[PDB]
Amino acid sequence: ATLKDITRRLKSIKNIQKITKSMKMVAAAKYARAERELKPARVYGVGSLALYEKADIKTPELIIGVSSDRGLCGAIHSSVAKQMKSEAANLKEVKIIGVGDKIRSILHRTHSDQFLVTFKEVGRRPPTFGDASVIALELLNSGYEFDEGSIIFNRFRSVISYKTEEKPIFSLDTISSAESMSIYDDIDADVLRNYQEYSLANIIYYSLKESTTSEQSARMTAMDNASKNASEMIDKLTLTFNRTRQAVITKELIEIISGAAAL
Template sequence: MFARTSALVFLPQCGQVRNMATLKDITIRLKSIKNIQKITKSMKMVAAAKYARAERQLKPARVYGNGAVALYEKAEIHAPEGVANKHLLIGVSSDRGLCGAVHSNVAKAIKAKIATLTGEGKEVMVVNVGDKLRNILQRTHGNYLLLSCKEVGRKPPTFTDASIVATELLNMGYEFDQGAVIYNRFRSVISYKTDEKPIFSIDTVANSENMGIYDDIDADVLRNYQEFALVNIIYFGLKESTTSEQSARMTAMDSASKNASEMIDKLTLTFNRTRQAVITKELIEIISGAAAL
């Protein structure tokens, strides 16, 4: 009789401790997910405010980019085949993450261009604007990096920021024939596309056949225009990429908040079921103990 009573008392205690541990684990996990959800909701609100400001500033910034390449398009400027052996790629991203595939898409486009150009025997160098892009390219294409720019994305980009990047590039003295600024072009709040704008050296523009449609252009004027056009295109790329980044981050944080809500609902249901199982088991033990007496 004593042995049977010991068994009745001992076994339920182990089960109760095990269930209590499970309930405690679920409670801790629920608390953790709720805290994460608060963070993602806050980040979504911040991203939404930054996105609204970036979208307002994007429209006037597009005038800079489109105006800068207008001369290239109207004069049909392009580097002669077999002569343009040096290419410069300027990739625009930022220093901040949690924005989907914004940075990796630019890196993917740059890697594809490098593979194509090097396959044709061309020399390629890369200027990356943003630490995230540098981290991606450094692992596999570090030997192509010419210049890396940090402190991008913490504040809305300005024309001064673009001027600093262009000045650093020009001061390095790297001579290239043609190239491209690769960035994420904003399309809508849920959509963006990796795009590029062409850039050319002063010699390439000056020696273009179609430049004859314009009056004689002084060399200093052409040099100033080329430098100003480079700054404009970089500024345009920064504004487009910033708007795309903020919209992508807002979308990503919204998805993360919804996923957290789903996990909270599932864990709450699991918690209630586990707690109900513990209560039911305790009632059965009480009834069984009373019946044994």
């Protein structure tokens, strides 16, 4: 421990304490907006799936990861990547789509050749149905007529709690017509080709609206922890400095007096 070293770490933790403090505030505004924009978007998602739950849909014989770009949000990108790699080995042909750069980097090296499309700038600007539609367009423009898929995302619960959730997407138009669909009448083969396409854009948007609410909340959290872990570390080293300042003055003085009291 030295006066040069001590103050260097005090100079830099008073940085982190503040840098982290504003990153809590930045995320705190983005949470409060994402919490309001989720309130309707939930009802929207509720009404979107209210058909696949009321009438059972199976498949006789596509993985979508939803997170963001900006990290430091605790364990948002890492919780969905765990449940993606869980199904990457458990299954059958598996083709992956990752929304948010932090899926192209966290679970890439392992499944580098199993990529279909990648999406950036997620979590910078609050998501829209317009963003979900670009996700819907690119999926249907690719020559991958998928049998069945599942979308994995972070569902919001509260300021601190969230859970990684799967939702199966029966978006194969060949799978749209099952024995449970025989209950329904007055349908076209190519009117489901319209409905299935749109109900896909809904659930993508819903998962995206849940994610950016669950993401900014735990970044607000992680940074409120980190800024007040630095607040504690400042208050700890500062009085460690005083110890070492007073002791250096005292010790430099004994060193003189000892030399004066020998002549």
